Design a protein around this ligand. Structure first.
Ligand SMILES: C[As](C)(=O)[O-]
Ligand SMILES: C[As](C)(=O)[O-]
Ligand SMILES: [Zn+2]
Ligand SMILES: [Zn+2]
Ligand SMILES: [Zn+2]
Ligand SMILES: [Zn+2]
Lengths: 327, 329
């Protein structure tokens, strides 16, 4: 069984699953302290329910919200929008790139206890258990980030829940992550190396898949175009087209690694952790939101000759194998 | 105006009595107490320790504390309200930002920060309806660009509401002078500002010049001393190795210079701490088993023994905080 914000579900219930998404990208305590930053909590919730319902109509049945503590994860919000949209949401533990001081000062043993409490006991006082561990590193792994990755590996080994990562693909950062995970005795089949569509280095990706890692091609609609004077939507966006990113999926399929591929949008319905109104920038670039994968990428791959059963394997079978707790 | 926001609602300033103007129930990080209460044993254990501690402070004469924990120090006003009611000690809550703002705060403009501080003063903290009665800000010795935004937003919020501003400084780097310059550039009266952690320095020229300008001087870490614990680097780094009597003698020094009306005294104590090394609360509790009662039980008799009149001490512990906290436009 897989833990969701509404309780446990069987593997067969998960269906078409988006493995790297967010309801809201924020900071610990921020949604509660300043909901008017998002208009209101109600407005944010209502936008998310419409968004999830659009995704559901395009075939999505489950999303994995990989928002951590320090991304301002509010599982009560996730539970509310999941119930109203009838879309399963898997919540995350772990730490992203903005840990507060009370986290930054902790040992690997302490972080392991924290990740374990969120998986085994529940998040806050909600009883909602995490079904995935999210971690992030920048280029060369910092000392604190290494502690996070080891704590993640140890919590995964104790519970069977998988680990999913944020990296800089342009720095081939998955290699350093993999080294740390393997030193801990973690199976690569429990690990998704994410934001992997941010590079054109196919050799780097194939090497990881060969070692048994899941490859997260999860920022496909963040491609953007026509924003090279933007001091925000050029370093956070790019200039590579989304079709170019999408073709990495075909490339990995053709090398015989369709079972290793996970695809997502890395979308959200509110964001406070960047510039004000960046949500408007994102929504203008990708009006499809979380429906971008099923509405654009899947038909694009089908028209490039990828068979239905392969597309179903990638969007249904692979996430189920990944999320089902396994040791 | 003649009333102050507390976590149980508004009180008249006459009700504040003996007030500790820089304290904490818990030193933490946003969201942390709710996500990981076992770090503190349990939320219940932490609340109980705070109530026992506040009750002892109350027995020693304390009637009000100002909890200067901000959003990013993990302020949980619901905890403050629970322990205030159970200890029957007034607690004034804070808005502002300390030294650990998350991205969602660090990326905000001075106008946005102003709106956040005003929300916490004028509307309430989170969904609790509890309103802040003070704005807490913190800087590095050299004020960073973001910290300067925070100080300007604090000044603007103070000017709109009358509620005071209190600061964290590196007194050894004379941090208060850069802060004062920013505050005054915004038109904020020095009488609305406490330059805190000023007992970290023995430079009386720095202290008296600020006091002469009408600033309140926070001599607010009196019990903090790692003397006898020099072999504990974290203790020394957090508390210094100046004695509590050395810190306390600055209270006398500013009185002797004629600035009794500018002095505010406190412990900068707390009942749990996650924003430093593990188990540090045990180190603090061993250094100062009196907790927040340290000021009334140890420092006040020390100053009376040094000859300071009872009326002067009452003015510092009662009148000065009342004048400071009372919203004044
Ligand atoms: C806050 As993000 C760019 O990881 O969705
Ligand atoms: C919470 As503190 C050590 O900055 O007074
Ligand atoms: Zn990411
Ligand atoms: Zn993400
Ligand atoms: Zn301080
Ligand atoms: Zn303090």
């Amino acid at each position: 069984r897989i833990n969701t914000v509404r309780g446990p579900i069987t593997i067969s219930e998960a269906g078409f699953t988006l493995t790297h998404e967010h309801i809201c990208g924020s900071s610990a305590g921020f949604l509660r302290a300043w909901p008017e930053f998002f208009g209101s909590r109600k407005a944010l919730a209502e936008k998310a329910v419409r968004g999830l319902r659009r995704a559901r109509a395009a075939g999505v049945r489950t999303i994995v919200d990989v928002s951590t503590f320090d991304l301002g994860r509010d599982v009560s919000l996730l539970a509310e929008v999941s119930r109203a949209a009838d879309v399963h949401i898997v919540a995350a533990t772990g730490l992203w790139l903005d840990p507060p001081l009370s986290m930054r000062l902790r040992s690997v043993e302490e972080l392991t206890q924290f990740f374990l409490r969120e998986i085994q006991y529940g998040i806050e006082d909600t009883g909602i258990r995490a079904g995935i561990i999210k971690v992030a590193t920048t280029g060369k792994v910092t000392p604190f980030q290494e502690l996070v990755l080891r704590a993640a590996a140890r919590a995964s080994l104790a519970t069977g829940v998988p680990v999913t990562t944020h990296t800089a693909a342009s720095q081939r950062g998955g290699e350093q992550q993999a080294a740390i995970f393997e030193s801990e005795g973690l199976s690569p089949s429990r690990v998704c190396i994410g934001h992997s569509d941010e590079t054109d280095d196919l050799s780097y990706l194939t090497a990881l898949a060969a070692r048994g890692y899941l490859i997260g091609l999860d920022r496909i609609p963040h491609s953007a175009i026509g924003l090279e004077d933007n001091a925000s939507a050029s370093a956070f966006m790019g200039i590579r087209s989304w079709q170019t990113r999408a073709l990495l999926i075909k490339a990995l399929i053709d090398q015989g690694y369709m079972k290793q591929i996970l695809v997502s949008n890395d979308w959200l319905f509110g964001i406070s952790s960047y510039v004000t109104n960046f949500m408007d920038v994102m929504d203008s670039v990708n009006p499809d939101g979380m429906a971008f994968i099923p509405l654009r990428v899947i038909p694009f791959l089908r028209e490039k000759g990828i068979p239905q059963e392969t597309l179903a394997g990638i969007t249904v079978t692979n996430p189920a194998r990944f999320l089902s707790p396994t040791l």
